[PDB]
Amino acid sequence: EWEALEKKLAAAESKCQALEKKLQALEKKLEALEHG
Amino acid sequence: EWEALEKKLAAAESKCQALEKKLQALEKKLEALEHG
Amino acid sequence: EWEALEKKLAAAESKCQALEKKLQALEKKLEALEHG
Ligand SMILES: [Zn+2]
Ligand SMILES: [Zn+2]
Ligand SMILES: [Zn+2]
Ligand SMILES: [Zn+2]
């Protein structure tokens, strides 16, 4: 249905934003190793 | 069209789930370096 | 609205593709550490 598509998109947007944060945290740890 | 939007969302959900797995695998390698 | 859903999906697709690239760049740095 239409409303179910709405909510699926919103969930995918939120999951991608959580993955962006998780990658930023990994990048921080990697850079500590790379320069230390 | 409507059905093409349906299938695009499903593909984006699946691609994001593959990226979540890929990040988990990287995190595993990073943690090995970080503590070894 | 319908057209706003269209554009939101397209933005989410593009953001996920940018995250895929960012993860590939991190993987490259991690592999340099892992084998060097
Ligand atoms: Zn660096
Ligand atoms: Zn994503
Ligand atoms: Zn650790
Ligand atoms: Zn390796």
B-to-C residue pairs, Cβ atoms closer than 8 angstroms: 29
Task: Collect all residues with Cβ–Cβ distance below 8 Å to C23 and sequence separation of at least 6.
Answer: A23, B19, B22, B23, B26
Say how many CA atoms lie within 13 Å of B3 toward its Cβ: 0
Tell me how far apart the alpha carbons of residues C29 and A29 are, in angstroms, rounded to a whole number: 12
Q: Which residues in A lie closer than 8 A to residue C16 (C-beta atoms)?
A: 16
Tell me how far apart the alpha carbons of residues B27 and A30 are, in angstroms, rounded to a whole number: 10
Q: Tell me which chains share at least 3 CB pairs under 8 Å with chain B.
A: A, C
Ligand nearest to the CA of A26: 3
After what residue numbers is chain B broken, C–N > 2.5 angstroms?
none
Q: Give the distance (Å) from ligand 4 centre to CA of residue C27.
A: 9
How many CB atoms within 10 Å of residue B19?
21
What is the resolution in angstroms? 1.9
Residue spans of the domains in chain A: they are 1-36
Q: How was this structure determined?
A: X-ray
